[PDB]
Amino acid sequence: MFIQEPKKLIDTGEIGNASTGDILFDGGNKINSDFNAIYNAFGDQRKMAVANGTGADGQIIHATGYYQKHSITEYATPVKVGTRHDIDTSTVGVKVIIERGELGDCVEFINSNGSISVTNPLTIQAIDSIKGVSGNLVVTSPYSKVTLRCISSDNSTSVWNYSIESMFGQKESPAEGTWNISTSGSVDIPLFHRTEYNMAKLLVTCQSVDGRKIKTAEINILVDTVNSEVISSEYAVMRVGNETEEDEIANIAFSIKENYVTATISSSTVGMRAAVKVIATQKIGVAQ
Amino acid sequence: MFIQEPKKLIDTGEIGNASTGDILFDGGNKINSDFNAIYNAFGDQRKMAVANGTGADGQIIHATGYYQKHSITEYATPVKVGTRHDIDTSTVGVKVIIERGELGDCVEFINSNGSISVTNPLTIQAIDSIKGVSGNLVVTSPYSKVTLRCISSDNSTSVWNYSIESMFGQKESPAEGTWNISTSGSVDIPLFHRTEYNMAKLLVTCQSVDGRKIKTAEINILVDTVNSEVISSEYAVMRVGNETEEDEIANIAFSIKENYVTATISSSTVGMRAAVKVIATQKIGVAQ
Amino acid sequence: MFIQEPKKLIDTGEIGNASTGDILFDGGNKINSDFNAIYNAFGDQRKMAVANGTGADGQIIHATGYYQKHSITEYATPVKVGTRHDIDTSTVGVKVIIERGELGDCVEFINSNGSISVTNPLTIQAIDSIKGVSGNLVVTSPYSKVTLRCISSDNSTSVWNYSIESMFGQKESPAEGTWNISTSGSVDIPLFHRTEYNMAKLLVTCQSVDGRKIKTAEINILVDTVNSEVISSEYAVMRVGNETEEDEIANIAFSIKENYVTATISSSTVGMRAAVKVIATQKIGVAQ
Amino acid sequence: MFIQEPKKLIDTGEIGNASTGDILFDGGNKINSDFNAIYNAFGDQRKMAVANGTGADGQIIHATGYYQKHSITEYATPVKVGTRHDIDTSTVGVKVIIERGELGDCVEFINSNGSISVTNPLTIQAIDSIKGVSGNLVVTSPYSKVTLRCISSDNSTSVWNYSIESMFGQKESPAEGTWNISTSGSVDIPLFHRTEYNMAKLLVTCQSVDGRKIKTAEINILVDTVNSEVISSEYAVMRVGNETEEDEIANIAFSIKENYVTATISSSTVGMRAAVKVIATQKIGVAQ
Amino acid sequence: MFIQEPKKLIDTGEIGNASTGDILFDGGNKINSDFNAIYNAFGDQRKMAVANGTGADGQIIHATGYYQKHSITEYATPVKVGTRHDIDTSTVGVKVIIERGELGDCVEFINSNGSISVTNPLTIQAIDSIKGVSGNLVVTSPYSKVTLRCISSDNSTSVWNYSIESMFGQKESPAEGTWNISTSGSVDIPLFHRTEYNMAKLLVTCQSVDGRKIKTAEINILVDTVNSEVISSEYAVMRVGNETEEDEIANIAFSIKENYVTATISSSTVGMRAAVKVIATQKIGVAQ
Amino acid sequence: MFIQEPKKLIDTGEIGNASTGDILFDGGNKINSDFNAIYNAFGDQRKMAVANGTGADGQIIHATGYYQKHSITEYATPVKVGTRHDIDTSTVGVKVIIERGELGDCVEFINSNGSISVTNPLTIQAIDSIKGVSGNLVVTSPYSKVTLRCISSDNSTSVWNYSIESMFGQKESPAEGTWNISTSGSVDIPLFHRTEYNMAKLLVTCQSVDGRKIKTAEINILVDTVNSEVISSEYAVMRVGNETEEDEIANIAFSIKENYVTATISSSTVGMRAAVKVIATQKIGVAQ
């Protein structure tokens, strides 16, 4: 037979305490904190002032990363490591201070509007110091890219070093490598199509398999497109195993072959190697 | 390609709005309200002063139902229809008032401690009135059961009627039915085992299938266990189609047969029916 | 090192599959089904037509239980076992049919408005049959209470029996028990306060501890409040071991003692017991 | 600027700690415990052996309440207060023991299959004792209803009393009340329709508004439907303020008026009240 | 006493509306949107076509970032700012159009398979225009890295500028800084280990603390590893405070010291400073 | 009328299975996996050993990206593509092996502490091979930046190429573009403020609108700040359409105008264009 148990009543005072509500609230907040962290590291932070960076014009993850636009008053306090800044010194130079760092910490600056100049510079103070710099780093190169990295921290020593580069320009090299001079005693090395550059600068170093013979030379070449030729000026020639003070070890000539500015390297010595590298170029663009 | 959608954040500003939290609290309290209503209708209400009728000595559902034990002060205000009361007038009479009812409404009382008396009565006032009673119903019968029922409501016409009966006592009837007087002209009707009662009272009405002959009589019988016999006293005899004022219509005798006090009904008239009903009994018990 | 695991996304394709959503709907409906079953068994079913038995005038649990008030059309189909009915035959007699039952099944009826009569009867048909009744049970007693109980089911043998009693009336017994006739040869048995009844009927059976002497008598008594006395009429006297046909075995007298109608039982025979039982009373009330 | 907060991760190490999971399991079981307690108090407990009282033939709430059918072995241990039992002693008598009770506690029994007899009795032992009974209560009345109630508990004083009555039978009273004898000196009191009963027994007590004149009588009446008359037998007549030992105080006659067996009460004494109460009836039914 | 409240029922129509289900679904989708945004910015987008970038070969976050491979038809519509592209012009030149930008917006291109050439170029049209370019930017440098940045937006003026660099090559500088010429009038500056380069180009500028004396010269040096010597060729010499047209101001010599090609700078003038920077180098590698 | 449904009970065995608990646990873990992936790609991985990269000093998203510091034993197994490394060869050279890659895959190395040298080099083995390299790539340039990119995969061929650059240094170019020589036959081109550099190297190429006349020359200039002048040395002059071997085609002069080192280019020929590019500079800093 059924022997009932006394009356039981649902404790309405236990509809909380680590139950959904508590977990979803604590979870969501954590999730939001993390995403805000990520989005603000790769997106425009100025959007946070609107729906917390949401909406049709809200924050997005830039695969290229993002450089923040901050105000003067905001730079009154040390910047955190890992941040990126797009500096604007249009109305006045700005100073940025970087908090003490640890080995590998980095901070990068960009100058999209090209406001950086000698009168309105970008002054950087990296907590403690910057190597090779007395005091603050003063940047006056417009449209520049400055990267600061901490090269020593341990404890009481926080030292940084920096790099400064142009954001824009044609810096590419059309050719760099090493080629063998075939048994025929000559090798053609295509440098670039006749229409890519008007002028190029290259370094050529030829050495025998045993290093007894070697020559190096710097060459500036001019592309004469109208006559389909290439003028050259070889200088700073240096040789080591030259049998005669007239013995070249290796001759370098230029011309256009198959519409490609081409370097022709030949040598008497057998088993000669030749390193060719284009370290500069100039292309006449459009004025302005 | 994949065109991302701007940043989306979790609206923690919601969550607790008519959700698992609200439906369990609005649901729980609802489940605790109903059950409480059921357990207090079929259980001791006095226990509500503890763990709200819970615990080891908590409230339970009495299949027999339950009769609440209230205090004088509590009965100071009209009682709700459908309630049950176990009255205690040991210290003083108690007055109970019943709220206006509607057809069928019911309130029942009992007196387990038998305190009801003429000095400590149970006074009942049924809003408006009680039929056959001018004013309040005054109950003075100890160990009684009082049932009040609304026999009329409509508008103001809220009238009640009542019944009062003993909670205890031997009230059973060992036999009641109708038997045919067999063609042989005689029928034996066992009433009860010889040890069940010392005396019984019965009503016997014999009638012909046509209805022209009929006799009724009231008989008191005494069980003589020692001599295995039964004395009888037949009176208030009434006959209708009796062809003569002599022996007539049907004879009723008693004796013990197979250890059962038995009634033997015989008649000359063919096709006679005999209704026998025991309406009272007395059994000698143990003094006190 | 930390070797990440590929991207993982939340399978929203799930969530609503047998979870908090499904268990609350499959649970709630279950809780509303049961309670409804309980409140409609102990409350007015007519209220279901409102807020499903809710609200201020909603359904409540009647400790006294409840007797449903249905319509003619509703009784057109067999009623379920265990139900209660408050019959209304004021406009016309009503026929109620009870579905086949099993041993113990029960259906109860009452007649609060007292409409039951011979012209507007309560006809009851218990699937299969009712003992001692050929066909339907025809109830014509106004303000009655009818109880039907299945006394046999097995296979088709589904038979019922019934009881019919008055809802109202004074049915209590002011005294019933057994008393010893003290060695002094006399015993006083208080029956009731002088103001409780005008007349009473009692059964008295005196028997010796051995069982050789025994007497029973039926006595009607009238309370004469004005003269503080009690008239009595003793009849249907029966004796067994009476040594003589003269005064014998036990005498029964009445009077008022301490304001209580009292029975005084005396006997010459030592070691006599006396069972006294009041089987009827009449109290003059207020006309109408 | 936006200064992010370090990475935050979701503490899955929690979740299932007193949350939706725990409150539904601790709540559900609670809801299933209570309902089970209610359905088993008002429904067949034998069904618990199936789908825990569920399914098509599951447990239901009986408005009439329910009386459990247990086995001998189950009754080997004391029963809880408030329970109901449908006894079966067809194969052998059964002994039921009731745990110690407190004032008002109740246990009820019925005998639907009418197996109770002197050879296969229902023996009841109420922890401590039953008033007027030395030892166990031995019930031998078939088709009876036994009610046990604790009339005293306190400390060890845990005493019970009981009532026993027939489950079936016609026990109703067709009339009970008080009527004024109109100034005309006569009053008609309709008792019942001529077809309702063959014989009735009534008590009649007439008393003057002052109380100096009073008469009571017991009358048995026989309905002669064929001749549309009613025979009566008035006896045990008792009078108090009767100015003469001749015809006196009030006369009682019977007849059929408007098809209703009717009592006509008349008296010379002005200002007389008449209480009439039918205490027994007999109706010839169908044999067997 | 307990005064129950009417029946209450759990509203099953409130198992939704901002409850778990709604929040978890809306939350998860947002979370997924964000992660897809991040992963697609730093991972292969071509994987989205498979299990939405999940699985054992699903998307991962590249610390180095990622450059997407898109098809010709996909470039038919403007590319979003912040995206990265790995161009493939193997079967035909491809044109990319960049949506209008805002100050700082950036888009970067890479050419991993070296397909870029004059016949199958990378044509870029940056909505509105590119500074120093008439119309589209036509890139013909294979294995190149092109970066476009918006240098002016405001409103109706969206101007971009670009940088083009080689993805590969030895561009490092083995030494750059400023050294003091000790009072001894000479300073050794280690340039690089004898085995790192065969040829180097440096710029040397010496200036007195007061800037009255200063000399600048460009020097190409050849490392003769066999004889453990270094040949040099100094030219473009310029001086300002030279006392005589024979006075050098500062002499620069080279040799191998401690196995490091070393610059030895000496001067008569006291307090002379010397800036040394290696602006080019050549190392003979392996042919092909 | 209400026709109840059998008992229903809440299945406590369904408080799980894809319900909150399961989804929140599976979701959270996925979320954590993703964020750990992101944070470890842009943050210090050494922090994972502490509270899983959480806390006040927990991991953060570096907008500049991050280069991991791993131990020798960790480099015993192939590095995944997309990773970044800050190499430390202070106590011994380290070897890194890169897993097979696919077109575009990249791995980048940095040397923040400048430990890289010939005795403690950075040896890199890119599964399969590196173009122009026999076997492993041996890096001996301190404070270097090495980038490896896969330029060919398909199937059985996984070839990589690399770039090596200095992490630090002044590499910026103060001017690069093309200017028209006005009809006046002369044009001034500001190069940089007098205080920015002591020496600069530029390439100048002038060509007529029809390309019949053209001249190219390399020029080193020295800024004499004390006398506010600029000394120049023009060489490697090459011309094509020169009418006479004395006809210059274009003359280039230098001076300080408005405090800016300035190039003045003039020519007889009408419609002459002039490309000016500064390919190197030297600024005397502070010794040490």
CSV table of C-alpha atoms in Angstrom, one decimal, chain A residues 282-288, chain E residues 132, chain F residues 175-179 189 203 205 274-278:
chain,number,residue,atom,x,y,z
A,282,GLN,CA,63.3,54.8,-61.1
A,283,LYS,CA,60.2,55.0,-63.2
A,284,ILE,CA,59.0,58.3,-64.7
A,285,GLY,CA,55.4,58.7,-63.6
A,286,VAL,CA,53.0,61.5,-64.0
A,287,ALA,CA,53.9,64.9,-62.6
A,288,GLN,CA,51.9,65.6,-59.5
E,132,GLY,CA,50.7,60.1,-58.7
F,175,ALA,CA,60.8,62.3,-51.4
F,176,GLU,CA,59.8,60.3,-54.4
F,177,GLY,CA,57.7,61.3,-57.4
F,178,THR,CA,57.6,63.0,-60.8
F,179,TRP,CA,57.6,66.8,-61.4
F,189,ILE,CA,61.7,70.3,-55.6
F,203,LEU,CA,68.3,59.2,-58.5
F,205,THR,CA,65.7,60.8,-64.5
F,274,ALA,CA,61.8,64.8,-64.0
F,275,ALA,CA,61.6,61.8,-61.7
F,276,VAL,CA,63.3,62.4,-58.3
F,277,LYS,CA,63.7,59.7,-55.7
F,278,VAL,CA,65.8,59.7,-52.5
